Amino acid sequence: GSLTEDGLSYKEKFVVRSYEVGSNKTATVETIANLLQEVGCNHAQSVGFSGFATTTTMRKLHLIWVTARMHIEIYKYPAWGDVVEIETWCQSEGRIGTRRDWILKDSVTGEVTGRATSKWVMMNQDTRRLQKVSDDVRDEYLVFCPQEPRLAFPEENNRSLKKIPKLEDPAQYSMIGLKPRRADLDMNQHVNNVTYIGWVLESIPQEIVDTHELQVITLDYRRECQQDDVVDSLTTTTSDSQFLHLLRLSGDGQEINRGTTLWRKK
Amino acid sequence: GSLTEDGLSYKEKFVVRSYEVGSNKTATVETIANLLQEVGCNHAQSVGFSGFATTTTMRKLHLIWVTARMHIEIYKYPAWGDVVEIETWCQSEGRIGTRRDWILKDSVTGEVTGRATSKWVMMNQDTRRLQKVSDDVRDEYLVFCPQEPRLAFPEENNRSLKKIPKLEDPAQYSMIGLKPRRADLDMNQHVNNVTYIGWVLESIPQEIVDTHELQVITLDYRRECQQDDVVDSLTTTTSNDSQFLHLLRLSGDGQEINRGTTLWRKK
Ligand SMILES: CCNc1ccc(C)nn1
Ligand SMILES: CCNc1ccc(C)nn1
């Protein structure tokens, strides 16, 4: 793994492991979202950030970078034993926060097999208070970003920026009583962003998973699920097959996530 | 990853990933059990077997290798970003089945940071009926094994071969209503052997996990948990060091699926 010649992006190769693949012997979408997370952490580490991408100002201010949205689009899931090359870079989005992008490539053919974009915001780690990002914070990471815009999804009016609606009760399909275990936590004891993807997908009928492959997934993150919390995953078909998703806490019905998935017939 | 000079063992290096570590920034025991599984799968692939290590006779006969026991003992959990080198080899145990062993090593110092041994049995995949290993099946994989004994736990009185008792109700601690999700299944849609390790450990109090580190884990596998099954994880302390007794059973009928023990030392 290394930063590119200009130092404004990072690349890494991954050999697909036996436990990382699904019933069709290709990496699951959760293995992909994990690999994006891993190359993201390695790009931050290689540029000085020893908290993910927490600058010197943020560590003292008790501020952290938090995912607001993740959008992944896959064309070909890499096979077990294959090598996948991922390129990642960060970009400032003014006071809103940062945008981290990815390009997934086949290491033998060089063809793009997928792409991802994520939108991150800054919050206080002691309270969920969303912040508008200071000008002094910006200048600390802006030196590690390209200045000319470089977007993984440059298409004006594409899937990555579309507003997601709330799932109306009753749902078509559901997977109730989901609790995270220790393997679902990160090194800071918080639930891993990838687990929520798995939970959304748990309500999809097995018949869709068996006859279709996941093409697009957009996940809006609203609130975090704590260790002792229980979750309900809801799904309704809105149509290729398209779905509407809602993650909420089993008890009060408090929203934690919302999203959509797009699937193609195998 | 490659077979050694003699072709009777396999080695592979792994860089510890950010999502693979625990609160102490070192690989979890579940990341370790997964890495053992991965190097096991790669040693079988590099020698012809590509079902895990299914011979051409096991394939026609609908026979598979299933884990009966796993024993892992760790001295140092590798840090996030560190490189761990694992060496694996398989050995025949007559008609009982095979034994697959591992040596975990630090890639910078060469020191052994852990070791593991697993005992595998032959089973008919359709009827779930166990059976002794035939001569014809044996001759197919014996060529890939060392003939002189090579044991990861060679000791005369070792923890890897001790009989585990059943946990008597009521348990001291428990973690009720555990269901596997799709990320818990392998490529054949069966529950992954590593998930059961996570389920045993879910009943351990957080105060043990925070003040102690896992040293030894022995897991006996008796029955598999199906996709739609729900599991109960039970724990009772049996003891400077903390020792526990574990029992995994199906929430419904109380059917046993796993039993084991864990050994923890104060950080
Ligand atoms: C290049 C390292 N800097 C950053 C800042 C924020 C985010 C989300 N990612 N990366
Ligand atoms: C070299 C491949 N041979 C085998 C056979 C059985 C087992 C459990 N592992 N490995």
Curated annotation (Swiss-Prot), chain A:
Reaction catalyzed: (9Z)-octadecenoyl-[ACP] + H2O = (9Z)-octadecenoate + holo-[ACP] + H(+)
Entry keywords, A to Z: Chloroplast, Fatty acid biosynthesis, Fatty acid metabolism, Hydrolase, Lipid biosynthesis, Lipid metabolism, Plastid, Transit peptide
Gene Ontology cellular component terms for the protein in this record: chloroplast
Subcellular location: Plastid, Chloroplast
The organism's place on the tree of life at top rank: Eukaryota
GO biological process: fatty acid biosynthetic process
Major place of residence: plastid
Active site: N188, H190, C225
EC code: 3.1.2.14
GO molecular function per UniProt: fatty acyl-[ACP] hydrolase activity
Biological role stated in the UniProt entry: Plays an essential role in chain termination during de novo fatty acid synthesis. Possesses high thioesterase activity for oleoyl-ACP versus other acyl-ACPs. Substrate preference is 18:1 > 18:0 > 16:1.
Similarity comment: Belongs to the acyl-ACP thioesterase family.
The protein's name: Oleoyl-acyl carrier protein thioesterase 1, chloroplastic
